[PDB]
Design a protein around this ligand. Structure first.
Ligand SMILES: *[C@@H]1O[C@H](CO)[C@@H](O[C@@H]2O[C@H](CO)[C@@H](O)[C@H](O)[C@H]2NC(C)=O)[C@H](O)[C@H]1NC(C)=O
Ligand SMILES: *[C@@H]1O[C@H](CO)[C@@H](O[C@@H]2O[C@H](CO)[C@@H](O)[C@H](O)[C@H]2NC(C)=O)[C@H](O)[C@H]1NC(C)=O
Ligand SMILES: *[C@@H]1O[C@H](CO)[C@@H](O[C@@H]2O[C@H](CO)[C@@H](O)[C@H](O)[C@H]2NC(C)=O)[C@H](O)[C@H]1NC(C)=O
Ligand SMILES: *[C@@H]1O[C@H](CO)[C@@H](O[C@@H]2O[C@H](CO)[C@@H](O)[C@H](O)[C@H]2NC(C)=O)[C@H](O)[C@H]1NC(C)=O
Ligand SMILES: *[C@@H]1O[C@H](CO)[C@@H](O[C@@H]2O[C@H](CO)[C@@H](O)[C@H](O)[C@H]2NC(C)=O)[C@H](O)[C@H]1NC(C)=O
Ligand SMILES: *[C@@H]1O[C@H](CO)[C@@H](O[C@@H]2O[C@H](CO)[C@@H](O)[C@H](O)[C@H]2NC(C)=O)[C@H](O)[C@H]1NC(C)=O
Ligand code: NAG
Ligand code: NAG
Ligand code: NAG
Ligand code: NAG
Ligand code: NAG
Lengths: 416, 117, 97, 49, 49, 49
């Protein structure tokens, strides 16, 4: 409802928590090129060496991927040097963090939400899997330290030493960073804490309710399993040979014509590995980009308060809490969403003595007959005074300037 | 397993045969691949020492100063209770380094000094 | 016709124009409010005053120079039409793809 | 006789086609409310026509 | 072999387009829907809209 | 007899080489004009030498 003299300003707000899921690492798969193509066959291996470093290059490329996957996890999670812990005191101004904090009364100390994340995600012919350098327990410790630092020290543990601060006072900074005055928090602290607690409870149901929420992490697992399943199935192909079984060619044919049939298997199987390795390298690049984005988000949204729109959830970003996830990371983004709004008539400046008065912070709004000044992100009407407005220009220049009166707080002090 | 009488072989999700029926004795026998794995050499720089430790990936310490890890069987590196910063990653939280008299040691890597606010 | 087919995009050209028009209308009439939350109407020169303070220029510079700023903006948009309809290499990134 | 060499190429190109529609949606479908401008285009002298 | 070469090129080229699409989505979120303070992210000068 | 297989490989490497020169142009040539510090090094005690 656009017009040249109408502004809408929120009068209420809600706390919304959104879930962003990003994959971080792939399965550290390592393939033996010689065993895959010429398992337990000396004769086949002697034919493989005629291709030079084909096998060695394929092993090297997969090794580089495996090392990179540990690098991806390191940059995302190991962004804190000190392992911070929350005190036994849970008085955070009414904010309940027990559903994202580690649960000590259970194996592999994890948060209730982290366990929910892990429970919703699901060595043969030269193929093995290598364990990651950082285990799930170690990643949980990293997220716990990042979580403890965020709650008890705000963004100070990232920039430098962890400086303790009462969490209500920390939220007052988070209000002031998005243009809402500190007093909005303290006057509404019980409402804000209740809305935050309810939103966290909704996260537990939401992820659980729909089983396709963690599809981003399950897609990585599914694609990697398909790549290996296709790789093994290629061993049963003949590629023009008499038999996919090497022992059924050697013991059914004289070597001079048995090498013609075997040369069709080495070419087929070596080409199969090259297709597999190329696909893994391309997929690893996609995971690396996702890991770089995840590391960037934790640096800017967990260790600080990002001002980038839609970077960390709809609304105005405050703070995020990281949660461990299999082959990835999950961020819980807490933002302010304005909820209840009213139509107000507005003006760009006001004429009092012929001089144009502009608001230092906020916008002028009229409730039909009276004129006030309020912060733009939360309706809170104040009497228009010389301490709220500044003087610049006159009323013959500003387009749309209206008449009203500025109260001067010093005049009655001098009169009295 | 209880194979149906006509069935003579067992098959894996892929094409590998896992189970079989012995022809003479009607007992069922399941097959398993003869163990295999990579042999990574854990070494400091040769300009410092020529002593090395050998890691056998994904195998037990029976088929191969022996430290059994999830990443495999580690031979030649001493197991140390004390944690340190990771120098040479092995896997599953284990890293190796050359430390003072001097020898190659294996330990669970430290994630950083603990603190409290 | 060698087994090669092209599939139509899920969103047509007129559908993308609707999305851009909605984004254009929200930016002009509601500033940044339609993105974070609900579309809160605001007079456009008042919205530019907010844009002034975001770069460290006091909003009174806008209202005192509103006619100059509007004229310069209108001229700049007209230059975009001339530049895009003259240079045969401006849209190279889309043509290269 | 080449097994999945043909099929997995069809799957790979199918994945790109789905991704291309995904790419358009993340860029343009960032509103989910079709806003319209007022009939009287009066925006303080700024010409958006 | 010709198809595998073609598909591999399409996969690599799709990654480049996907990166541009992600950048375009990031810009429209930050340049259009907000007021970016990142230097030269929304062109030369101090970004307004 | 293999058609364009040779030519495509040359084209792909040529595209990489051009991209590398573009890589240096975006990173470093972000300033239009070549600025120089004066012979006066009085920067309030900050030693930039
Ligand atoms: C902002 O809206 C919330 C609702 O989201 C208001 O809180 C509710 O107030 C009603 C009374 O009218 C109670 O019955 C509900 O139990 C409250 N809900 C919660 C979660 O506290 C809140 O009062 C509104 N604030 C303002 C300033 O209007
Ligand atoms: C944080 O919220 C949890 C619930 O999400 C509170 O734990 C509940 O406590 C009540 C009363 O002791 C029990 O009956 C419930 O079974 C608990 N629920 C769960 C799911 O644990 C917890 O007390 C709150 N934290 C604080 C300090 O109040
Ligand atoms: C606009 O707000 C002013 C200030 O709140 C209102 O004026 C007050 O009205 C109440 C009655 O509801 C009186 O008790 C006060 O004495 C009034 N104060 C002053 C300074 O006049 C005014 O009624 C409101 N107008 C509208 C249309 O909402
Ligand atoms: C706002 O108030 C000023 C004066 O305080 C008004 O200025 C007057 O304009 C009228 C009509 O143009 C003249 O008759 C008066 O002589 C002007 N005042 C002076 C000091 O010369 C102005 O019109 C008022 N604005 C509105 C719209 O009422
Ligand atoms: C916005 O600018 C356009 C031109 O950029 C103006 O359109 C002109 O309209 C007049 C009729 O009054 C025609 O004679 C011109 O040929 C139009 N120019 C073009 C290129 O269409 C339009 O008047 C301006 N809008 C407003 C509301 O002033
Ligand atoms: C900036 O620091 C450099 C050293 O980092 C200073 O250069 C020294 O100059 C003195 C003469 O007073 C020589 O004796 C040193 O050997 C120089 N050191 C080096 C490394 O060049 C230099 O003087 C400082 N700049 C200014 C203007 O004070
Ligand atoms: C403001 O007025 C418009 C009519 O132009 C109406 O559609 C809209 O709902 C009003 N907003 C509120 C918050 O009442
Ligand atoms: C606002 O628009 C109305 C038309 O509805 C017009 O009469 C009035 O002069 C305009 N005011 C300004 C300041 O542009
Ligand atoms: C490494 O060994 C070489 C011997 O080739 C020696 O010259 C060099 O100083 C040594 N460096 C260190 C850091 O020990
Ligand atoms: C194989 O390793 C496991 C440890 O996972 C160990 O418990 C077991 O005893 C080992 N097998 C033999 C035969 O020693
Ligand atoms: C660690 O210390 C315990 C005693 O608490 C001891 O039993 C164990 O052998 C030690 N392990 C190593 C590797 O030194």
């Amino acid at each position: 409802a656009y017009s040249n003299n109408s502004i809408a300003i929120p009068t209420n707000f809600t706390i919304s928590v959104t879930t962003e899921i990003l994959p971080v690492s792939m399965t550290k798969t390592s393939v033996d090129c010689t065993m895959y193509i010429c398992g337990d066959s000396t004769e086949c291996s002697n034919l493989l060496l005629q291709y030079g470093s084909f096998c060695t290059q394929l092993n090297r490329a997969l090794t580089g991927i495996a090392v990179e996957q540990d690098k991806n996890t390191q940059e995302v999670f190991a962004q804190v040097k000190q392992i911070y812990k929350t005190p036994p005191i849970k008085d955070f101004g009414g904010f309940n963090f027990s559903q994202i904090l580690p649960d000590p009364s259970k194996p592999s100390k994890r948060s209730p939400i982290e366990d929910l994340l892990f429970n919703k995600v699901t060595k043969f012919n030269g193929l093995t899997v290598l364990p990651p350098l950082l285990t799930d327990e170690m990643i949980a410790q990293y997220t716990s330290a990042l979580l403890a630092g965020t709650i008890t020290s705000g963004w100070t543990f990232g920039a430098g030493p962890a400086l303790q601060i009462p969490f209500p006072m920390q939220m007052a900074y988070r209000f002031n960073g998005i243009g809402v005055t500190q007093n909005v928090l303290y006057e509404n602290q019980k409402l804000i804490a209740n809305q935050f607690n309810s939103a966290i409870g909704k996260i537990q149901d939401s992820l659980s309710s729909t089983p396709s929420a963690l599809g981003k992490l399950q897609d990585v697992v599914n694609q990697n399993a398909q790549a290996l399943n296709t790789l093994v199935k290629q061993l049963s192909s003949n590629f023009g040979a008499i038999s996919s079984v090497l022992n059924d060619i050697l013991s059914r044919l004289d070597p001079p014509e048995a090498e013609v049939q075997i040369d069709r298997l080495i070419t087929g199987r070596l080409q199969s590995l090259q297709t597999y390795v190329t696909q893994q390298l391309i997929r690893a690049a996609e995971i690396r980009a996702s890991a770089n984005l995840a590391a960037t988000k934790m640096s800017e949204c967990v260790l600080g308060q990002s001002k980038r729109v839609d970077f960390c959830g709809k609304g105005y970003h405050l703070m995020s809490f990281p949660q461990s996830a299999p082959h990835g990371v999950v961020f819980l983004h807490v933002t302010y969403v304005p909820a209840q709004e009213k139509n107000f008539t507005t003006a760009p400046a006001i004429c009092h003595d012929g001089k144009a008065h502009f608001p230092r912070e906020g916008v002028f709004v009229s409730n039909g007959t009276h004129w006030f000044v309020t912060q733009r992100n939360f309706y809170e009407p104040q009497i228009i005074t010389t301490d709220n407005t500044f003087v610049s220009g006159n009323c013959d220049v500003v387009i749309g300037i209206v008449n009203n009166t500025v109260y001067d707080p010093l005049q009655p002090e001098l009169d009295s | 397993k209880k194979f149906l009488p006509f069935q003579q072989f067992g098959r894996d999700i892929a094409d590998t045969t896992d189970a079989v029926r012995d022809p003479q004795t009607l007992e069922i026998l399941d097959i398993t691949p003869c163990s295999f794995g990579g042999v990574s050499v854990i070494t400091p720089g040769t300009n410092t020492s020529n002593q090395v430790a050998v890691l056998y990936q994904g195998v037990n310490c029976t088929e191969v100063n022996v430290f059994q890890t999830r990443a495999g069987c580690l031979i030649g590196a001493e197991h140390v209770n004390n944690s340190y910063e990771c120098d040479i990653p092995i896997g599953a939280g284990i890293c190796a380094s050359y430390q003072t008299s001097q020898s190659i040691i294996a330990y669970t890597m430290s994630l950083g000094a603990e603190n409290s606010v």
